Structures are given as structure tokens and as C-alpha cells.
Short mmCIF file of C-alpha atoms in Angstrom, two decimals:
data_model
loop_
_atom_site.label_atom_id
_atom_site.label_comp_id
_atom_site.label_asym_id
_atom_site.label_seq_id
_atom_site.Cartn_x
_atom_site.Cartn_y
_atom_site.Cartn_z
CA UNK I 1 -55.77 -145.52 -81.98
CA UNK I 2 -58.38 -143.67 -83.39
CA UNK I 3 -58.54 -142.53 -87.08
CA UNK I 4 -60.75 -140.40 -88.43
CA UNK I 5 -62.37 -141.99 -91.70
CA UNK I 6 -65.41 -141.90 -93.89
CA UNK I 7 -68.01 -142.74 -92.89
CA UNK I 8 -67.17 -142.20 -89.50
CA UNK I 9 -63.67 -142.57 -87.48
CA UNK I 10 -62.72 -145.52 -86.27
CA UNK I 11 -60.69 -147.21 -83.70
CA UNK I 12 -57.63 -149.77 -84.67
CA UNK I 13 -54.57 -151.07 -82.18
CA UNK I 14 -51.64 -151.11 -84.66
CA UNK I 15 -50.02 -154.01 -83.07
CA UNK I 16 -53.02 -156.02 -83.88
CA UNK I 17 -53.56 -154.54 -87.20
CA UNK I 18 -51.84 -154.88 -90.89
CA UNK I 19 -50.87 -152.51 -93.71
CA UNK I 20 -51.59 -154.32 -96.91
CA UNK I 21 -49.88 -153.34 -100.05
CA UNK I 22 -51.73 -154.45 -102.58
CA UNK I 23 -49.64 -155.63 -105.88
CA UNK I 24 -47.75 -152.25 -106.16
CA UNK I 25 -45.60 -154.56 -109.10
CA UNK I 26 -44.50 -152.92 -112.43
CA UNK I 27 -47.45 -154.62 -113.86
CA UNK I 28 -50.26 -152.41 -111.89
CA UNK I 29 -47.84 -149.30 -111.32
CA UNK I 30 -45.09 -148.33 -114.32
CA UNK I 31 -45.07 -147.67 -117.49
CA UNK I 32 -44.96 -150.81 -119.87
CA UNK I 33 -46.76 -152.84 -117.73
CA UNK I 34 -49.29 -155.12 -118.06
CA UNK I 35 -52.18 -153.02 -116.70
CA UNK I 36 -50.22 -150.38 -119.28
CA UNK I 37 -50.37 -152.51 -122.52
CA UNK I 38 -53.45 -153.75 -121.91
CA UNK I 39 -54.74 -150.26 -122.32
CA UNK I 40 -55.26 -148.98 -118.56
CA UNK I 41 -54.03 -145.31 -117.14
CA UNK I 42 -51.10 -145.88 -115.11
CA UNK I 43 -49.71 -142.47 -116.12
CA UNK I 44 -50.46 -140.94 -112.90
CA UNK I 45 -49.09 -143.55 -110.36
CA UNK I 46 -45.97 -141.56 -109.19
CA UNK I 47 -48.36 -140.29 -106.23
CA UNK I 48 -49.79 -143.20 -105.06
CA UNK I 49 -45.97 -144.79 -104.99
CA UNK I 50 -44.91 -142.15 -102.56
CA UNK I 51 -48.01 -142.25 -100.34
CA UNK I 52 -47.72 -145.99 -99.95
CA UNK I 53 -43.92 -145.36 -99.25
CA UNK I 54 -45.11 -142.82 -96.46
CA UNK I 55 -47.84 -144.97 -94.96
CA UNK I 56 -45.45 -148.25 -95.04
CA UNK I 57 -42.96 -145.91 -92.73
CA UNK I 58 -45.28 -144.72 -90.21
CA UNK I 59 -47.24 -148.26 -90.05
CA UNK I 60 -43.79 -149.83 -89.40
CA UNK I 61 -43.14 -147.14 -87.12
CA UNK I 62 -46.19 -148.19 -84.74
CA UNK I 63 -45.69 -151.66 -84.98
CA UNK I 64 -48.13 -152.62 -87.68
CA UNK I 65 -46.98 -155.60 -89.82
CA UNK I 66 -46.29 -155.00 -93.34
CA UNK I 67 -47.95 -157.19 -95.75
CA UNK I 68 -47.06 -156.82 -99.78
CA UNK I 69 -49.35 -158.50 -102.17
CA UNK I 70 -47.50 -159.48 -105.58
CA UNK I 71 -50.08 -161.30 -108.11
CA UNK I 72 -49.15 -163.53 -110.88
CA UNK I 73 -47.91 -167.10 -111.74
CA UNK I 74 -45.67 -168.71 -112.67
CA UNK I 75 -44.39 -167.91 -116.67
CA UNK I 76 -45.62 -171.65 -118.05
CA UNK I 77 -49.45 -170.15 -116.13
CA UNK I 78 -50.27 -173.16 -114.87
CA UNK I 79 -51.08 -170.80 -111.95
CA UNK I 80 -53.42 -168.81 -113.87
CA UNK I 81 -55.39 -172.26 -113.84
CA UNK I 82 -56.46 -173.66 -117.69
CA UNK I 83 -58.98 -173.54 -120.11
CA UNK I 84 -61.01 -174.25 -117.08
CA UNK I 85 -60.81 -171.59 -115.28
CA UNK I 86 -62.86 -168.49 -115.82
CA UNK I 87 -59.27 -166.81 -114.50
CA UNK I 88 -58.30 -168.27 -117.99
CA UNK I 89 -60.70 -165.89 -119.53
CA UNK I 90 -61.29 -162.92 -117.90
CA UNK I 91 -57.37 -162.46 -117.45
CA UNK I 92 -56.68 -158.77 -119.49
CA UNK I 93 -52.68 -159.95 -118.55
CA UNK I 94 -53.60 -163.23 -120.28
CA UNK I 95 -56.03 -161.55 -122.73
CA UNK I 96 -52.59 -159.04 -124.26
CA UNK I 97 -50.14 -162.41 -124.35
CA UNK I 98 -52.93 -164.34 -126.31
CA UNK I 99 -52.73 -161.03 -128.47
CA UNK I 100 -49.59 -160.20 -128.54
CA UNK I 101 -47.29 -163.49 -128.58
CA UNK I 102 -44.21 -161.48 -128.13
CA UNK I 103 -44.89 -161.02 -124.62
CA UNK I 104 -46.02 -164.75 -123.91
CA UNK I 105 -44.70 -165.22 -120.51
CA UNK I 106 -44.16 -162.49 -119.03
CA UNK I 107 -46.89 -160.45 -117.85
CA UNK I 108 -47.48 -161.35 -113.88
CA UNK I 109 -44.81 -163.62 -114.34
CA UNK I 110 -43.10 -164.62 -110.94
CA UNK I 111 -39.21 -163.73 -111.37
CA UNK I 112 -40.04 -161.13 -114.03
CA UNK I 113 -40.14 -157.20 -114.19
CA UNK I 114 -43.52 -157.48 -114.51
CA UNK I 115 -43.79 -159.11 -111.26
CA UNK I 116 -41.04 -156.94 -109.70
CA UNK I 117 -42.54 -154.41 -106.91
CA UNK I 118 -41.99 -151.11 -108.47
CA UNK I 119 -38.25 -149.70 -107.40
CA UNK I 120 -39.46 -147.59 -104.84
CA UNK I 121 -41.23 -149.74 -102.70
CA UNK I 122 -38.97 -152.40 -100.94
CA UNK I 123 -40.24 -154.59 -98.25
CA UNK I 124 -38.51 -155.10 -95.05
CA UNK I 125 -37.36 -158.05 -92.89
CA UNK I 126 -40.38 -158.54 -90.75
CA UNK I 127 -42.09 -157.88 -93.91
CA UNK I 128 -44.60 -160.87 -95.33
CA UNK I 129 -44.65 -161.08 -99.03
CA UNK I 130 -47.40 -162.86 -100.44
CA UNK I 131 -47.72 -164.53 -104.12
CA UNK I 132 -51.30 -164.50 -104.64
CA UNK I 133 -52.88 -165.99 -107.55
CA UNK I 134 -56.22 -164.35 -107.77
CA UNK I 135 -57.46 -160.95 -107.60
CA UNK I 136 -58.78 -161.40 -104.19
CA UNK I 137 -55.94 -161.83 -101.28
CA UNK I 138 -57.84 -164.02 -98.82
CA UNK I 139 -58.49 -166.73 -102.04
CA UNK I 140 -56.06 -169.76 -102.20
CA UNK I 141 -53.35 -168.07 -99.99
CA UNK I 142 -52.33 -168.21 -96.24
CA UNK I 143 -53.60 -164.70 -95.85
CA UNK I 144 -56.29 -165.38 -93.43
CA UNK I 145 -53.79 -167.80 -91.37
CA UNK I 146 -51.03 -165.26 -91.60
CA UNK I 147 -53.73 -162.89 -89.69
CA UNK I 148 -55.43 -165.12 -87.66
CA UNK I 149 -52.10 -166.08 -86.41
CA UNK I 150 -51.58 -162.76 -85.11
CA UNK I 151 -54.71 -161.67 -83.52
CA UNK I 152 -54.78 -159.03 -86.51
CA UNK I 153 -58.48 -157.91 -87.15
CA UNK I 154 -58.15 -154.54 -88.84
CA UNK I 155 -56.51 -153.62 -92.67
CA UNK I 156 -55.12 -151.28 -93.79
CA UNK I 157 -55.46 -151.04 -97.85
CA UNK I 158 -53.34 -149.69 -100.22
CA UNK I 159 -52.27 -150.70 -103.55
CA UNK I 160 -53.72 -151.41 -107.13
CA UNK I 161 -56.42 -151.92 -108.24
CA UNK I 162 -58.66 -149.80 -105.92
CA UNK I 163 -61.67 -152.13 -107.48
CA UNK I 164 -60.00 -154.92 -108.41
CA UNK I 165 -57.40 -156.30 -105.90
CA UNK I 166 -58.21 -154.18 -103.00
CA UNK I 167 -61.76 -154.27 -102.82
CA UNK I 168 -61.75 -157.78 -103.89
CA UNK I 169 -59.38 -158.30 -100.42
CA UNK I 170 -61.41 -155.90 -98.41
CA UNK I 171 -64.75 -157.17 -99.09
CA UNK I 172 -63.91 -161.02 -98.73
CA UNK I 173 -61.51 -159.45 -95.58
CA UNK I 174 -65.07 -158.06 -94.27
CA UNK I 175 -66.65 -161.65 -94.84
CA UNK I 176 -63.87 -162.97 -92.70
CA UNK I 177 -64.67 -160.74 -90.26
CA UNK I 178 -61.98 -158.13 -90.68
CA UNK I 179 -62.45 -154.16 -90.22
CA UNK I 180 -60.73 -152.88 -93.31
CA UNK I 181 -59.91 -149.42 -94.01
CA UNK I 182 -58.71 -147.99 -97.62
CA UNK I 183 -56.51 -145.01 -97.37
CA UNK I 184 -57.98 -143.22 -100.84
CA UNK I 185 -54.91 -141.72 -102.00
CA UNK I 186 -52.98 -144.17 -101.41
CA UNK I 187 -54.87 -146.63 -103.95
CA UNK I 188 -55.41 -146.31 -107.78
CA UNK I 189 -58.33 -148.03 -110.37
CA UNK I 190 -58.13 -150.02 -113.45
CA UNK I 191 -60.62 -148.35 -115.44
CA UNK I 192 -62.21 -144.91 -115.69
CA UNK I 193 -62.12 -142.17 -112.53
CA UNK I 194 -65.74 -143.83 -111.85
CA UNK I 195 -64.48 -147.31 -110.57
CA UNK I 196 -61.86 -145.27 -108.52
CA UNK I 197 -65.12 -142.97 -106.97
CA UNK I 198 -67.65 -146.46 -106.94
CA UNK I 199 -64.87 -148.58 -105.23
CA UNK I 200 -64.29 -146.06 -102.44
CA UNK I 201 -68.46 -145.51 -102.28
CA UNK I 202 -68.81 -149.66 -102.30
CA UNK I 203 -66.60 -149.86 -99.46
CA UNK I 204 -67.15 -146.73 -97.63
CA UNK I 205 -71.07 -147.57 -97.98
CA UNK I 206 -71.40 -151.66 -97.21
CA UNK I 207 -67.76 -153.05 -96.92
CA UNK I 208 -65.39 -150.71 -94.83
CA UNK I 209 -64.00 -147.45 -94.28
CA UNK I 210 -62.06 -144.84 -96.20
CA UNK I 211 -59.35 -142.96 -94.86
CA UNK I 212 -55.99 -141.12 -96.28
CA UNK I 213 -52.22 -141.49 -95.95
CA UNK I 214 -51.80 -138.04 -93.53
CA UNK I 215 -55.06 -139.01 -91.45
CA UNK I 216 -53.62 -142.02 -91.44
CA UNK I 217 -49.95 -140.81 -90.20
CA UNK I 218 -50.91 -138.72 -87.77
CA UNK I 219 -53.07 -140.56 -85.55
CA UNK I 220 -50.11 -143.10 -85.41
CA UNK I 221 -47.25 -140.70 -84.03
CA UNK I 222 -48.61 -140.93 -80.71
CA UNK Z 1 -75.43 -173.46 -125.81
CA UNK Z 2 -74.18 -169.58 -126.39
CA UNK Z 3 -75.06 -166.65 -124.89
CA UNK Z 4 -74.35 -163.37 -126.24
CA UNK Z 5 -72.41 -161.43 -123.59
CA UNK Z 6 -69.81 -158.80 -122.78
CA UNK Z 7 -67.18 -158.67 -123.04
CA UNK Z 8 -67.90 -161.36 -125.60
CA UNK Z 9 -69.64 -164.04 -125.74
CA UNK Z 10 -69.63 -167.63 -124.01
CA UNK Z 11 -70.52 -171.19 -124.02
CA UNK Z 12 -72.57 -172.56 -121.35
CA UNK Z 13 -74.84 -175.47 -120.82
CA UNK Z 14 -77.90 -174.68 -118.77
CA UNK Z 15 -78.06 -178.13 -117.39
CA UNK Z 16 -74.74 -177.75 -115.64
CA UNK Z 17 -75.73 -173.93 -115.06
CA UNK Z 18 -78.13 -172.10 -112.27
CA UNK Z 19 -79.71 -168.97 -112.35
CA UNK Z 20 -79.70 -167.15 -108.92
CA UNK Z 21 -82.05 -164.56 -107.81
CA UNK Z 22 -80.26 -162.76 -105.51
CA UNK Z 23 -82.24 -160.91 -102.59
CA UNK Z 24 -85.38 -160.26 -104.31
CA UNK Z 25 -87.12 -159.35 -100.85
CA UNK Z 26 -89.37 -156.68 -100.01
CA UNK Z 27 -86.57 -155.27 -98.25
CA UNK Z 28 -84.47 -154.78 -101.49
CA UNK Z 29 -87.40 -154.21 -103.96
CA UNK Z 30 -90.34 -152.93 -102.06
CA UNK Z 31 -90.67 -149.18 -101.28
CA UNK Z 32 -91.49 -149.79 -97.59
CA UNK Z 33 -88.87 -151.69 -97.43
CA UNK Z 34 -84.80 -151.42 -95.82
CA UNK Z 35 -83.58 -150.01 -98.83
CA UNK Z 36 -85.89 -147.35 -99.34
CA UNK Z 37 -86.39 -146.54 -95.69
CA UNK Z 38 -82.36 -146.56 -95.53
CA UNK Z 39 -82.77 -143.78 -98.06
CA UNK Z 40 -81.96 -145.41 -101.49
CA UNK Z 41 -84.19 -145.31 -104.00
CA UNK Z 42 -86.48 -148.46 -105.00
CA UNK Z 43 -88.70 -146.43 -107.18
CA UNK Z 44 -87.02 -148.32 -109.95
CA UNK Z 45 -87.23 -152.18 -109.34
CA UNK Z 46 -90.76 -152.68 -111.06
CA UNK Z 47 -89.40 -153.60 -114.16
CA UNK Z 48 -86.59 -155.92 -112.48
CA UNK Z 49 -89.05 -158.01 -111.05
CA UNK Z 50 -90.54 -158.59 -114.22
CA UNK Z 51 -87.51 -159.13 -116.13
CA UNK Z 52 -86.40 -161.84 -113.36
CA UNK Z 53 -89.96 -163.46 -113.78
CA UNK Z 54 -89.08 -163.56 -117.65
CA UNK Z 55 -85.64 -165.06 -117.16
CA UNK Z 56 -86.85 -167.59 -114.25
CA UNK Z 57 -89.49 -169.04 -116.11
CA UNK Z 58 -86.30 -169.53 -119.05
CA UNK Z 59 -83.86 -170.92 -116.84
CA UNK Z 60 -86.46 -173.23 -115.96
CA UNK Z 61 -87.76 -174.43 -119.03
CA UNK Z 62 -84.04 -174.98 -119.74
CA UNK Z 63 -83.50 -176.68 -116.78
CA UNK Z 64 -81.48 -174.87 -114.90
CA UNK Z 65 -81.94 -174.76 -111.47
CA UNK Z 66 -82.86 -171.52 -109.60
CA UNK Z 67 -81.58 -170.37 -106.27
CA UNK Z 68 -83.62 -167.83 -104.52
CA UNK Z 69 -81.24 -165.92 -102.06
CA UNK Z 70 -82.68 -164.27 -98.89
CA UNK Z 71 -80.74 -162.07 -97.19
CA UNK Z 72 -80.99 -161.20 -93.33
CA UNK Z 73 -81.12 -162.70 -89.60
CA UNK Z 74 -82.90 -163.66 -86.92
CA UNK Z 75 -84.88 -161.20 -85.34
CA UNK Z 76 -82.87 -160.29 -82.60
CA UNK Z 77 -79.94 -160.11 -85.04
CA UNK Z 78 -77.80 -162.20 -82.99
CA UNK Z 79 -76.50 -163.83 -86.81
CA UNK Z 80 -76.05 -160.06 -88.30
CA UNK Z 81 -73.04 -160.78 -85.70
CA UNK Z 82 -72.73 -158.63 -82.50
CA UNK Z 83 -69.63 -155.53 -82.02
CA UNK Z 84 -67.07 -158.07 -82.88
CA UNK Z 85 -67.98 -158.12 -86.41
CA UNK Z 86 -68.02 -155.32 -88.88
CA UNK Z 87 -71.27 -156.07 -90.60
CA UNK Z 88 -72.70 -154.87 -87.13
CA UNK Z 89 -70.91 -151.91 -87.87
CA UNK Z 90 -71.25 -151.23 -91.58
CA UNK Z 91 -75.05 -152.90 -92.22
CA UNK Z 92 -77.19 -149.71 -93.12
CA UNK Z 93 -80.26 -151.69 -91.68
CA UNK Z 94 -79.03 -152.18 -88.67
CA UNK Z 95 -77.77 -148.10 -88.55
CA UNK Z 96 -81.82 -147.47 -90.13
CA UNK Z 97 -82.49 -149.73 -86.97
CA UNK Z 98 -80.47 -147.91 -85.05
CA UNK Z 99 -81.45 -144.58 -86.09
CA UNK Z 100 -85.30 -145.44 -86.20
CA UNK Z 101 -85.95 -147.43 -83.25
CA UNK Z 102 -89.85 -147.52 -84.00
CA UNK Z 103 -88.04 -149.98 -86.76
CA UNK Z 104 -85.95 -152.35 -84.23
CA UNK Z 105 -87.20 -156.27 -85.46
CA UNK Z 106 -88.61 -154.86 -88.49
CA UNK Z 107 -86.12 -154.78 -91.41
CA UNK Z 108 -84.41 -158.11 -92.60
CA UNK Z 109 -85.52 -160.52 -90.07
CA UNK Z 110 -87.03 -163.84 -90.59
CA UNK Z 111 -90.55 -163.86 -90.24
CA UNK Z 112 -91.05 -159.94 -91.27
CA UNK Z 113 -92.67 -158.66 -93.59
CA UNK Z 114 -89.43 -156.90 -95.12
CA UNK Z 115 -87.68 -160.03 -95.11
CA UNK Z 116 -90.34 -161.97 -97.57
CA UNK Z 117 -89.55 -162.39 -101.04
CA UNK Z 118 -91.82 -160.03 -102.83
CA UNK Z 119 -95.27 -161.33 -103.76
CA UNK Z 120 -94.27 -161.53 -107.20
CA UNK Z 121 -91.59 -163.94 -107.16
CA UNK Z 122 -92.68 -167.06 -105.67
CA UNK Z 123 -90.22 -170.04 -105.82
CA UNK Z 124 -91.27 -173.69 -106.98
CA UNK Z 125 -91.12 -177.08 -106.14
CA UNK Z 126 -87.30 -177.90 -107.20
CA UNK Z 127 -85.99 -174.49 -106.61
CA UNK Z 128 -83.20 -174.12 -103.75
CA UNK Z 129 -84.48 -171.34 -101.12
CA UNK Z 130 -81.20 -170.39 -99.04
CA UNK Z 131 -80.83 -167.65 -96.50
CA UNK Z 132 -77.80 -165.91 -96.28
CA UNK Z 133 -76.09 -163.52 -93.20
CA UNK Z 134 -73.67 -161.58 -95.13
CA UNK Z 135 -74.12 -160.02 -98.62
CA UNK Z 136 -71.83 -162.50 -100.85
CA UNK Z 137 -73.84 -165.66 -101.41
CA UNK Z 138 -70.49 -168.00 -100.93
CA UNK Z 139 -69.53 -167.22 -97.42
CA UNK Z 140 -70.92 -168.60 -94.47
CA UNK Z 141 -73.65 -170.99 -96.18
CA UNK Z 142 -73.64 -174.54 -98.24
CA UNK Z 143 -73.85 -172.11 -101.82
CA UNK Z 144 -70.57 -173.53 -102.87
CA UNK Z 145 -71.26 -177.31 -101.81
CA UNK Z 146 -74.59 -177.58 -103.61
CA UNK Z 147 -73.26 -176.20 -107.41
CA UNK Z 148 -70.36 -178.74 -106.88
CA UNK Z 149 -72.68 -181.13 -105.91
CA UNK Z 150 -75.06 -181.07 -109.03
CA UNK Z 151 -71.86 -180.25 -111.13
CA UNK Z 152 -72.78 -176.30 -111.98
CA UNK Z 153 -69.56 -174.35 -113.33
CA UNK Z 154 -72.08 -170.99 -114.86
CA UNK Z 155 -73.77 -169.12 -112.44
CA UNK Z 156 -76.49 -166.49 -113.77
CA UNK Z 157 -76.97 -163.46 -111.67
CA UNK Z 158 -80.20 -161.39 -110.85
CA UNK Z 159 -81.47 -159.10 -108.09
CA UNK Z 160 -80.56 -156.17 -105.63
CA UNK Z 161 -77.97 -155.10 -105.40
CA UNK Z 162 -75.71 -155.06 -108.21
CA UNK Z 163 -72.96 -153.58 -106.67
CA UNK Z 164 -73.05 -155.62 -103.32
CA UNK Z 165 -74.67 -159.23 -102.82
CA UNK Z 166 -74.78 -159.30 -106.59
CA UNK Z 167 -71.34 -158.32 -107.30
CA UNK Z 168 -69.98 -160.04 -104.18
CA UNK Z 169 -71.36 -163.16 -104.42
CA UNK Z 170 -70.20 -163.33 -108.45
CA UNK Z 171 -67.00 -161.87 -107.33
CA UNK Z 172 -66.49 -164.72 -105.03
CA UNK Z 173 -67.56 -166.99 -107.58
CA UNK Z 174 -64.85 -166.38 -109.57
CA UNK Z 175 -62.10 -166.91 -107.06
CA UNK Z 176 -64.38 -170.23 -107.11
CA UNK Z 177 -63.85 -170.89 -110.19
CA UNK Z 178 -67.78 -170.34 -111.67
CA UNK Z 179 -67.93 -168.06 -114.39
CA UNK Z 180 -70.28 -165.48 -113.67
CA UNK Z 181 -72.75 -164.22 -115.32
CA UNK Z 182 -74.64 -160.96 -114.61
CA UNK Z 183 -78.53 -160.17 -116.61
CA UNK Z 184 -77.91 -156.11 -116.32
CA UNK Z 185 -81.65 -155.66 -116.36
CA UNK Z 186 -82.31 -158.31 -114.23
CA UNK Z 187 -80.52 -156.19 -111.16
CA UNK Z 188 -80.79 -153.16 -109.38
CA UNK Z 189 -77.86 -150.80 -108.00
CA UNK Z 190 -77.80 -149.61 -103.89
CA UNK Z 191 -76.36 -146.27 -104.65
CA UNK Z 192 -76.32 -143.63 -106.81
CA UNK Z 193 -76.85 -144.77 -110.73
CA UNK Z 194 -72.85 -144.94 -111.31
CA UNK Z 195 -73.03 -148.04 -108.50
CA UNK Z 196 -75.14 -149.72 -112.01
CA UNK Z 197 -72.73 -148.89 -114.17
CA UNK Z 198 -69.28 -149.49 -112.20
CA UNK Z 199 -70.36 -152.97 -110.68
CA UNK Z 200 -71.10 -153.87 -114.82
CA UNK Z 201 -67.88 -152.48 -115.97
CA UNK Z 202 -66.14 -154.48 -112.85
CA UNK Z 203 -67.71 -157.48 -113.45
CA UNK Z 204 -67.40 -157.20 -117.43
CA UNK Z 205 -63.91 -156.17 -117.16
CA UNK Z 206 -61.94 -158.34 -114.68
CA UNK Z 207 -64.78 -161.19 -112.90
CA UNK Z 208 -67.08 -162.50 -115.87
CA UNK Z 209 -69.73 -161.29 -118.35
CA UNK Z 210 -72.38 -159.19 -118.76
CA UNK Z 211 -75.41 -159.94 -120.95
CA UNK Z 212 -79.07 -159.09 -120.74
CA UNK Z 213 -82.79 -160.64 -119.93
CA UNK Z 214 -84.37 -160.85 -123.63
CA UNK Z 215 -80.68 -162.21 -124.65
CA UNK Z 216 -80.85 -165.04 -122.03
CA UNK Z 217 -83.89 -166.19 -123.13
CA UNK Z 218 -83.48 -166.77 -126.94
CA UNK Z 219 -79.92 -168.57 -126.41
CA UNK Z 220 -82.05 -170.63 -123.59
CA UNK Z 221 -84.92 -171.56 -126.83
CA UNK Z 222 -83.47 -174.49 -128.56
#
């Protein structure tokens, strides 16, 4: 399959080749999150939602697994690792809780709303959901494994945070020898438009590839 | 010890602490070099090179160990990985290569000229040297091993490019649990001047902290 991509088109096999959805929880997507009351712009998320929704369909369609990302720990953080950790302190979900007691617990908490995928987006049988505890997917998870196992070498990235979680994944993806691809529109940022724009130039420049949902789409109907 | 940092400040002591001087070659700093002939600019790094000279000869005094990083391969770039790996794909010097055959052997290969740290920077007895073939510091080489080894939990980051090796290598710190520490004009962006900015505001935000040469020095003087 060939799909045309910045900086140039590329070729993928969809059967050995993954769509990641990358923590599309209430935390990095809805209103009253996490990302939210810690002070990010979530308020124009109902667009990447959809465009994930339409890319999981036509990956599943062509035989690409399905892999969701859901980050956070467990409530007690013990996850989140202690004092110790420099997780412990760079944390903005642990950085509002410290702040604002009230919602000790609950940000990224596994079992929680927080934690919940967003309504719309509801994986599949088939579908692998993984628990990661740090930004970066292929860190302290069976991601790799999961992969390897398959003979999958190419990613396909969507989710939240374009410069956070995803590019995390897709640059340690590229250091485990993975071609990743990031379908822009299909991604948001934590932080001002620029981290959206210097994500996508990051890994359309040294990393990966850049892409979009309909690009995407269409070179899989065949 | 503390240093002054955003997005506020931390505790650190430079015994258990290394400063690393990531990529300072000719290829990275020098116009002449990869970087420039690639077509980014390098007219810049004059004052970085100074300002890692400044916080070298601190670290030192302080006794923190310094790791040089130098990026690149063998000449026949059989370790930049062949078409199985992306990095033969998405490495601009081996597209410049590629492009510019005049060039082939010439950019980032041991024993070039391009691939020498620049004549300013010239590593000392008790410094660690270490070559690396991919632009994070922690994949594919003993990085990790030898800060556990000595018992280093603060890495201090300087050199070219912000926004890649620099922010990768940090990055990957991180998720290995060193807090990361980034002198802002002790590096140098590959990119357009928002690659400067973003990588800070990524790292400040979400990875570790950002802080500054002259700052470094006078929490390094007692």
C-alpha cells in the first residue's frame, strides 16, 4: 500500500502494520479532564474524535491491528513511581492533585472517568489495549513484544498529545526500528498551536512521516 | 546543591550528576559541515560553543563527569542501518549524501573531518567519549549502564540539536528515570527558530527543566 505523506509517500502492508491510538481518555480529550484542569485547550477535540473513529474503521477494514494506548496508574500512584521519580515531578496530572486535593486520585486513574476512553471511541475484540505508565508507549510495556510478535514494522499515530505521547512513541518506535507515520488531523498538542506545528516538523523532518485521515483512507480501500 | 530552573527549581548533587555534550561535531556546529550543507543554518553556534566551554569547565570543577556524544557511522554507513531501517530513510545526511554524491563518505563518518568534535571542545583525561548511531543517546549504546554504574540520577544537557539528539536523548532519560536537565544556551535548534523554542517548552513542560549556562555555574560555586 502506498500512502502519500510528507515528506514523501510511503509504502506500508496493513497486515503487517498497526493503528495506534494514542490515550484518546477523558483526561487528554473532554472537557473536565486532566489535560483540561490543568490548564490545556481541549476545546477543540470533537474533530480529532471523529477522525480517529474514521481511521480506526478503515484500518480495521484492511486488516491492520488496532492498538489503544490508555495512560495512568493506579489511584494510590504507586505507578506514577515516588518521590524518586522525575515522573513524580514533571507530572501536570500529579502537579493539579498536589494542588487541588479534591481531586487526589483521580486524574489518570485506572477504573476512573479520567481514564475512561472518551465515549466515542470503543475498541474492538481483536483490539489490544495497553495501560502504559509513561508518556512514551514502547517504555515499561509489552509494546515492542506485542509488535515484534507480529512482524508489524510500520505505525500508524493518532491520539493525544501530538508532542507528548505520540511523538514520544514514534520517536523511541523509530529507535526500535519502526516506520511511523502521524496522520496530522487525526492528533492534537498539549500546549500552544506551535508544539502541534514543531511535533509534526520533528517527525516529518528526523523521526517519521506525516500523513492525514482521508490520505490515509483511501489508499486502504483497495 | 540547587539550580535555578524552569519550571522551577531543583535539587541536584553534581557528584551523582553528569553534564553531556551532545554532538558538538563539526558536522552539527561547523558551517562546512552536515547541517549546514543539509541546508540548516549553523551561522549561530559560535556562542554555543563557548557557553558549553563555560559550563564544562563548571561541571568539572564540580565534579561532575562529562560525556562527549558523537554522533554518526562508519564510513560506509553500514551502522546508519541499511533499507530495513528508517534512519536510512529519514537521516538528512544520508539524503545530502544522496543528493550530493561528490559528498558520499564525507558527512558523519568516523575518521572525517565532519565527524570530529570541533577544535574547540577537546575532551580530557576522565571524560567519557561515546559514539552513538541514532540521535537519542540511550538507545543502542552502554549510556544507560555507565550513569547507573557511577550512581548519576541528573543528567545536564548541551549541544545540537535541541529538538532531536538533545531532546531525544533527555526524553528517553526520563522514561529512565534521570531528571533532565537542558542549559537553553548551551544548545542549538535543527530547524526553523520555533524547533528552539518548542523542544524548551516540551522539555520544560512534560520531561524535566530548563535552566541556563551563567545559572549552572554559580549553583555549581560552593
Amino acid at each position: 500500500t502506498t500512502l502519500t505523506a510528507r515528506p514523501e509517500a510511503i509504502t506500508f502492508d496493513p497486515q503487517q502494520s498497526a493503528l495506534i491510538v494514542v490515550d484518546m481518555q477523558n483526561a487528554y480529550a473532554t472537557p473536565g479532564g486532566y489535560l483540561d484542569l490543568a490548564g490545556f485547550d481541549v476545546s477543540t477535540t470533537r474533530p480529532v474524535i471523529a477522525n480517529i473513529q474514521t481511521a480506526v474503521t478503515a484500518a480495521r477494514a484492511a486488516g491492520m491491528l488496532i492498538i489503544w494506548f490508555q495512560n495512568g496508574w493506579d489511584e494510590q500512584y504507586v505507578e506514577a513511581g515516588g518521590p524518586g521519580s522525575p515522573n513524580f515531578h514533571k507530572s501536570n496530572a500529579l502537579k493539579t492533585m498536589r494542588k487541588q486535593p479534591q481531586l487526589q486520585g483521580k486524574l489518570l486513574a485506572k477504573g476512573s472517568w479520567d481514564y475512561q476512553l472518551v465515549d466515542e471511541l470503543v475498541p474492538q475484540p481483536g483490539d489490544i489495549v495497553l495501560p502504559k505508565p509513561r508518556y512514551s508507549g514502547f517504555f515499561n510495556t509489552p509494546l515492542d513484544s506485542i509488535l515484534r510478535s507480529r512482524g508489524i514494522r510500520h505505525l500508524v499515530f493518532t491520539g493525544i498529545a501530538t508532542n507528548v505521547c505520540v511523538e514520544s512513541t514514534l520517536r523511541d518506535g523509530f529507535f526500535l526500528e519502526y516506520f511511523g507515520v502521524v496522520l496530522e488531523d487525526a492528533t492534537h498538542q498539549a500546549g500552544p498551536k506551535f508544539a502541534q506545528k514543531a511535533a509534526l516538523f520533528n517527525i516529518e523532518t528526523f523521526f517519521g512521516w506525516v500523513s492525514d485521515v482521508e490520505t490515509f483512507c483511501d489508499a486502504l480501500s483497495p
